[PDB]
Design a protein around this ligand. Structure first.
Ligand SMILES: *[C@@H]1O[C@H](CO)[C@@H](O)[C@H](O)[C@H]1NC(C)=O
Ligand SMILES: *[C@@H]1O[C@H](CO)[C@@H](O)[C@H](O)[C@H]1NC(C)=O
Ligand SMILES: *[C@@H]1O[C@H](CO)[C@@H](O)[C@H](O)[C@H]1NC(C)=O
Ligand SMILES: *[C@@H]1O[C@H](CO)[C@@H](O)[C@H](O)[C@H]1NC(C)=O
Lengths: 725, 728
């Protein structure tokens, strides 16, 4: 009479047998959007529901991109991945009057970035590290920049560290809304040291190649930045156009520093956010074009400073300013007196700022700013850090708070994100759990529910045939403070049996792993098929619960986060249904670091662990991330905690545990170096362990074949550790 | 019951073999280090005195790695700051102590980053290499004379080898040869300008923030090789007012027509030198004999004195052309050469005649010529009892070479079947070294009447320790497959029941030229496996091992990864049907060429092997070096042998690994078999969805021989095997 449905199996996960539909769409105006219906790209109506085929069923096309004036379309193909965001591609442009490929002045192959202007059909592209502007797809490119040099000078695109860590994007250029100006950044990596690693390629390659990338590790030379802006409107200087530099404020010129972002606030006002390499001080420069000359006016009474007292500035970087349409006001998320991030309103002419939200909860992002409302996401509802809901607040009197999503579907839906059309006339709401993802469309006017876009009924019906695990989300209180955790529980869970326990850890700063999101992943398999409980715990300083929790780790990575994982397992351990002799832990990247530090703790709580692409020593990781939390590796600053918080210093304690260490050899992010040094430390101390390298894989180990292999291999390891035939 | 031989005993050298390492300094005396200081011994009577007391307060301030006494006993050279490079390559600091006073030499010292130093064969001249250039000192306390000016890191090598010449050709770092006197210094120059680099990462100390890329000129199969020149200097010509002049000797035109190697150089007299050259298609070698012309300063290589070596069945020599052994007069020499039925025997040559007379014959092989006097030749062979894995010393009369005496065969027939020998100057005395199958035994003899003089070391101390350990036994025997017998050994666990069912590890190497079944006493990993874990460790010599004639050896010519692999499987099969072996628990492992075989075996689909360990395997011959690879495989081109290069990769057999448990191990700083090779294996297994185990050892080279890594790799392999064999 026991349940005899199939379980959710490893093959299920790897083959993606059970598909989550995500209804991915792209707004193209205020009332119409783009959606791929299987083989076709449809255009839809927001007001109603009429759709029409836009493009229906040699070159595999990676993406299509239409100009804001509807007259041309770009398609990229021959797509070749670089780093996380960076790519090269070929581009051809077609007409939108006569669906015909433009034959003449064609964008070069090996182009690195392309972008329409916000209006009209202007195009700027980056190729061999220099910026080019096409006045029209048929006419000739104008060369804006002549300094570009492989691995040395980057114009209009980022170098490695700016791509991964500060911009989270490859693009380093910014059209004015007019289309008049084109702003761009220039990066100089001349003195940045290179990470070099072997790349083995196809078996046919007789000698291995070595990849060389400018990559500043903690306390190494950082690249330098310059900011320029060019007038594309009138630039009759066809051979040599004239670029106008805006310097950082003298506040920044005292040492090395970063450009964090640029925002055009109006047609002739641009905002620059700079940050010192000691990332506890950031300045906002407001710069105004003066038509009498060709200069810009930054440094004045318009500077807005942000200092961090108990940590660093922002979560992963200073918050983005949102400007009014007549932009001499802007809204920005800022940590307040009690240490919770809320929205402050700014006036551009001096003054401080005025908060318009408050409470023991955090605004995560401002999603849209209209002439009458500000929309934002927060975890206010039900006091649940792991929840996310859409809110709107009235502009003039900001007391008026409506939640747009909270009560839509409170059982199924506790984790919302949003996508607004042009002018925020409509929005797609995206519910990511704990139910099956639910995707709805709304009009802002009365924010009425128009339609349900996707309800994942299909998946739901399939899953009825499968023994699926449940997820429990709750909290424990260690010394005065609630700390949240989640458990993935085997089907037909029986609190009178003993189950093995896998702690899934990331535990990096700014981070959150106990949440309300629905996932089908490796944990799903472990719970369903192998009857393993998979838990996650957010300790000090996980994110989204105030600075007192988040900043607890400042200048002291690999202490309190590791501590809290241990004693979380101890508490989990005390409940009757957890087998104390079969507790394990695994994690990736920062999670690999914490796993390794836990296993080397000597705690005696954990039987075994798996570390995938771990950091091992903070001097090995990039300057922007680690220096944010760790300061600089010098005697004068924080060298001392840099040295006592390596994995290698704890190798002796690994004698007690079964350890599995995995790393891709072409990891450009966390370098194979880091695991190479862990293994050497373990060897030197006489500790046995298991290892696996993945040839030519990077940080994601994300090739279809490698993806399957790694999870297969980890499943074998876990099962043997827990004595599961 | 008694204690077993445990893994720790192997790793910690608990039970040590004692050696007796001596250095003949004359025709009747040898040096020997006893505990701390250096003794000099009279061979006839065995009495000794102190040559150098236990007082390194001459340096005192540096700990000495090694040292070297000048031939005339006047000086001692000590090295410190020893820094390993490749297999034989290293760099060091050096001081010279003048033994006939008390003081070290302080002015005109040997520079601190020196790459190689050697005394002359007599007297106390010195030649050394520093920044890739050769220097000579006529006296330790006189200034150095610079001989070469072209030296350039990683590009021009004077007096020292580049990678491929060090590893594969000379088997040494040195590329200089003093004449016997020695008035002349001969040296080779290597030019690696157009040789592609192998690049790999070196991670170094934890404190190194950025990994460094190591770049080494290394010719892979069918790439641009280094070129060589050869010179000789008249050292007696160096004076305060006289420059160094380096006379070139050019290769013969039969070599100059294409790519070629310098194989070896042998001084025949104080005025006569032999050089062996080898074509890159290694089917053809030429030996030149060159005479010094007094009033010219030239070296004359008469065409009439050339001798050429060709093969049909295969390549020339075992790993290289054999060495010539010249008579005192220098007008004749003896060389080991393959005969009509493919057996290596001693041929006698006159330097001006092409036709050579064989003076030994039989279905066995001469391994080496050890000594030549005016009346006898001494050599080692495996003739005795028809056992290819035994070695005995014989002597043969030069006149009636039909008169042969075996000098070691019957000295101790049960305990001693594997000998090597060290003769004195002019061969008045010799030390016999017995290496198995019993405990090592060292003896001294007089050549006069092959009288035994005394036992030097009998390892009595080790035997008595070993009486309290459960030691395994060694069985050496053969099977016959078709027309031929093939030899194997088994390490047998103590208490060995021939009806009970034992798990079997096949220990394999099986590279060309090689031998894994023999008479040697070893304390190793297999000893622990047998003694502690009760596992039988077998090895098998198939096609094309030595030392059993060209018929067996050349069988894999141009076909690496075929018959070698077949024969290991067959061997396991014939072991299988023994009542004392469990066919459900057969494993295989090997290192280097042995890792390749292991891998090709496991990927075979044989069904024989449950599991397997490959340590630093070759996976694809295009990845390995020109000299070794092309010897057996020719060139990777359509017109030659590319078809089989492509047919003999481990990667091609990836899908067949589904059925076995595979552990793949490789050091990341392997300069010899590059990590690339295992990296391609792993990728091919990944791409085919085959699970396996892996281990890298960062910064370890081909031998994985660092103290801690050695310990780690063996305990890791032991865990793997035991779990394979359901042992623990
Ligand atoms: C309905 O939407 C389609 C999609 O583009 C559009 O073409 C059509 O004009 C819409 N219908 C009306 C009457 O607006
Ligand atoms: C980049 O910086 C280097 C080193 O300071 C300098 O020589 C060079 O002029 C800079 N390049 C540009 C285009 O600014
Ligand atoms: C050994 O004794 C012999 C015979 O008395 C003597 O001639 C010789 O000097 C001694 N050798 C040494 C090195 O002690
Ligand atoms: C080394 O060979 C190159 C040819 O590639 C040549 O240019 C150079 O002169 C050679 N060096 C010597 C010392 O002959």
């Amino acid at each position: 009479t026991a349940d005899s449905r199939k379980t959710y199996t490893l093959t299920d996960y790897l083959k993606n047998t059970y598909r989550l539909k995500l209804y991915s769409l792209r707004w193209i105006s205020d009332h119409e959007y783009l959606y791929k219906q299987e083989n076709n790209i449809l255009v839809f109506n927001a007001e109603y529901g009429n759709s029409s085929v836009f493009l229906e069923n040699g070159h595999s096309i990676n993406d299509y991109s239409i100009s804001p004036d509807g007259q041309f379309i770009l398609l990229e193909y021959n797509y070749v991945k670089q780093w996380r965001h960076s790519y090269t591609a070929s581009y051809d442009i077609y007409d939108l009057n006569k669906r015909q490929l433009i034959t003449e002045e064609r964008i070069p192959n090996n182009t690195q970035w392309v972008t329409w202007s916000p209006v009209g059909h202007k195009l700027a592209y980056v190729w061999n590290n220099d910026i080019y502007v096409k006045i029209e797809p048929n006419l000739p490119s104008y060369r804006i920049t002549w300094t570009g040099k492989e691995d040395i000078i980057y114009n209009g695109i980022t170098d490695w560290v700016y791509e991964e860590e500060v911009f989270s994007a490859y693009s380093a250029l910014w059209w004015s809304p007019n289309g008049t100006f084109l702003a761009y950044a220039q990066f100089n990596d001349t003195e940045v040291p290179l990470i070099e690693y072997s790349f083995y390629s196809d078996e046919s390659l007789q000698y291995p190649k070595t990849v060389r990338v400018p990559y500043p590790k903690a306390g190494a030379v950082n690249p330098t930045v310059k900011f320029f802006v060019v007038n594309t409107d009138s630039l009759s200087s066809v051979t040599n156009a004239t670029s106008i530099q805006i310097t950082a404020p003298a506040s920044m010129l005292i040492g090395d520093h970063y450009l964090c972002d640029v925002t055009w606030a109006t047609q002739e006002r641009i905002s620059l956010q700079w940050l010192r390499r000691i990332q506890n001080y950031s300045v906002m420069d407001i710069c105004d074009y003066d038509e009498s000359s060709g200069r810009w006016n930054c440094l004045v009474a318009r500077q807005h400073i942000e200092m961090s007292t108990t940590g660093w500035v922002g979560r992963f970087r200073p918050s983005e300013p949102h400007f009014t349409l007549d932009g001499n006001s802007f809204y920005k998320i800022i940590s307040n007196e009690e240490g919770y991030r809320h929205i402050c309103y700014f006036q551009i002419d001096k003054k401080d700022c005025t908060f318009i939200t408050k409470g023991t909860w955090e605004v995560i992002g401002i999603e849209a700013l209209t002439s009458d409302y500000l929309y934002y996401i927060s975890n206010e509802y039900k006091g649940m850090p792991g929840g996310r809901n859409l809110y709107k607040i009235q502009l003039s009197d900001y007391t008026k708070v409506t939640c747009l999503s909270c009560e839509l579907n409170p059982e199924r839906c506790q984790y919302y994100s949003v996508s607004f059309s042009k002018e925020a006339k409509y929005y797609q709401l995206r519910c990511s759990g704990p139910g099956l993802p639910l995707y709805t469309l709304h009009s802002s006017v009365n924010d009425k529910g128009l339609r349900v876009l996707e309800d994942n009924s299909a998946l739901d019906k399939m899953l009825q045939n499968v023994q699926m695990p449940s997820k429990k989300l709750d909290f424990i209180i260690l010394n005065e403070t609630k700390f949240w955790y989640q458990m993935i529980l085997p089907p037909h869970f029986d609190k009178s049996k003993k189950y093995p326990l896998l702690l899934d850890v990331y535990a990096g700063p700014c981070s959150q792993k106990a949440d309300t999101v629905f996932r089908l992943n490796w944990a799903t398999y472990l719970a369903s098929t192998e009857n393993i409980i998979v838990a996650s715990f957010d300790g000090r300083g996980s994110g989204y619960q105030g600075d007192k929790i988040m900043h607890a780790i400042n200048r002291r990575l690999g202490t309190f986060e590791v501590e809290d994982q241990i004693e979380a397992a101890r508490q989990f351990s005390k409940m009757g249904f957890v087998d104390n002799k079969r507790i394990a832990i695994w994690g990736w990247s920062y999670g690999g670091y914490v796993t390794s530090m836990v296993l080397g703790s000597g705690s005696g709580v954990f039987k075994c662990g798996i570390a995938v692409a771990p950091v091992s020593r903070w001097e090995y990781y990039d300057s922007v991330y680690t220096e944010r939390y760790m300061g600089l590796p010098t005697p004068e600053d924080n060298l001392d905690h840099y040295r006592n918080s390596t994995v290698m210093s704890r190798a002796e304690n690994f004698k007690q545990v079964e350890y599995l260490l995995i790393h891709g050899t072409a990891d450009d992010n966390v370098h194979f170096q880091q695991s190479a040094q862990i293994s050497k430390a373990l060897v030197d101390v006489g500790v046995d362990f298991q290892a696996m390298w993945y040839t030519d894989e990077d940080h994601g180990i994300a090739s279809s074949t490698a993806h399957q292999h790694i999870y297969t291999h980890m499943s074998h390891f876990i099962k043997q550790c827990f004595s599961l035939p």
